[PDB]
Design a protein around this ligand. Structure first.
Ligand SMILES: [Mg+2]
Ligand SMILES: [Mg+2]
Lengths: 315, 315
């Protein structure tokens, strides 16, 4: 009962593809533009040996640079279906081990000569696949069958920009946007440095204590993937006053923080929660006001479903 | 009751954008590649005059070349929401008049100073926006506020191909693929002409009488949009023998049809139904076997969700 049957579930035609992929003007390669709506697609065929029984298990093990999901983190639930639309294997995905463990239903005792296929949306493990225009080996083991493919990733980090942001990830359970903002990558000096975030369709939760400010101590902390390793970083959150306003849709912080000038470099992380469950569409707008003027970077969320919103004053 | 309040619902910042759009390498323009996953996005802000009351109506009227929806036809249901996630206007889209009529709830009596916005996925009206690399004026009237934007469409009709297919539309209610296949656009002569369709993840319904063969009598009838006008066409369906096999996943037709040779040109339409409701992913493969060898064209469906299937022999 619970027997591991990795050796009895046989995968063929394993493939990782970039969907849709962006062709690099100069090199001619198709790349994975992770911040331009590309995803990875993992596909395979499989057969199940007849001796497999109800409750037998098998695993999908994903590698260092590869995981299921998209910008949105994968569900803990991962199921496989039959052509009738019924679940035949119930899977639990563990992020810590980057592994899904599937358990067969009674389908495998009710049916013989089973063959199937799947297609799964997949992505870079951003905390490891860190750097723009760099090939990373995307690896997976389905049962005991291994496959790998090199994928060139680009996240578009423009290291000359004084303000640049990206979605780090979307939470699968609450659809919150988990943001990463890079301030001062090019190491200028400022004598005014007001950082404002304005949310459309989202709100901050100040009580959740998830607006975090890290002082960079090494340029290589700014990973191109916008998924820095917050355990390497200097947390200075408590030194700053983050002021909320506009129904928790605006956050303002004086990054000078009582100094007359600063050449400090920052990684800022934030969590923005959709207004309601009818949509997660919206926009997050960043501005940085310095002595030289204002820089801006925005992040828009517009799905293929459409949406609408409205507000008014109750009488 | 039921007062038309088009004059009392005011739209601003109306926009139609191509999402994502494709840049034409030669011309430099951003184009709507309708068969390469682009859609249109209609956006606007609005305000509601306070005198509007429950049951008051307003329209969105779409133009000759523009409609809501995507490759998938729009729902008859079109709602507007507030930031709490509640419906504030219940809409009915009529394809015949290309108009949505919205009815306000009691939100517009219980609230004052209402403003809002929407974002709607939209598309070409393919029966009218027929031709590749052609600008079509995409027009809409929201209330009494009109807007238009020229959009260059491309469907990728390669007129030199002896066989080419496209999705005409996806049915919104049953997710069927409604396909258009062009045979012999360049008008060659054949002495073998076997046309086969193979479905993966879909089945034909032979009983439904929706596999149609039209004999082209004017090159113009091949519209690049793959949405020909079947009223201008010569229906020859009943002359041909369409042979179903492989669990209604394969259809085979001898297009020579008892002649020794043929230079006829054909438009073929078909309807392919998903195996189940858990997904509509899958593929349709077409081949044409002539004296010269075999031509093939395929259409794949791979959503951002993932899917899986399987089949076996019930014990
Ligand atoms: Mg068995
Ligand atoms: Mg009113």
């Amino acid at each position: 009962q619970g027997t591991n049957v990795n050796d009895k579930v046989h995968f063929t035609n394993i493939d990782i593809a970039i969907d849709k992929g962006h062709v690099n003007k100069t090199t001619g390669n198709t790349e994975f533009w992770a911040t331009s709506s590309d995803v990875l697609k993992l596909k395979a065929n499989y057969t199940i040996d007849d001796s497999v029984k109800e409750g037998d298990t098998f695993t999908f093990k994903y590698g260092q640079y590869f995981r299921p999901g998209s910008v949105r983190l994968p569900s803990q639930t991962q199921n496989l279906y039959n052509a009738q639309g019924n679940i035949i294997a119930k899977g639990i995905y563990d992020s810590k081990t980057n592994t899904t463990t599937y358990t067969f239903t009674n389908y495998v005792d009710q049916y013989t000569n089973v063959s199937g296929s799947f297609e799964q949306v997949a992505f870079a493990k951003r905390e490891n696949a860190t750097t723009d225009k760099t090939a990373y080996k995307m690896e997976v083991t389905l049962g005991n069958d291994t496959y790998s493919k090199d994928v060139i990733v680009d996240y578009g980090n423009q290291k000359g920009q004084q303000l640049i942001s990206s979605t780090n990830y979307i939470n699968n359970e609450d659809l919150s946007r988990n943001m990463t903002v890079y301030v001062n990558q090019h190491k200028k000096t400022y004598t005014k440095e007001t950082f404002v975030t304005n949310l459309t369709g989202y709100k901050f939760n100040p009580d959740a204590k998830n607006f975090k400010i890290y002082e960079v101590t090494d340029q290589n902390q700014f990973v191109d993937s916008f998924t820095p390793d917050t355990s390497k970083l200097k947390d200075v959150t408590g030194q700053f006053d983050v002021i909320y306003s506009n129904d928790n849709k605006t956050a303002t912080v004086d990054l000078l923080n009582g100094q007359s000038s600063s050449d400090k470099q920052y990684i800022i992380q934030q969590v923005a929660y959709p207004d309601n469950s009818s949509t997660d569409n919206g926009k997050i707008d960043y501005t940085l006001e310095t002595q030289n003027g204002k820089s801006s970077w925005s992040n828009s969320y517009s799905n293929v479903n459409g949406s609408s919103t409205a507000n008014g004053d109750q009488k």
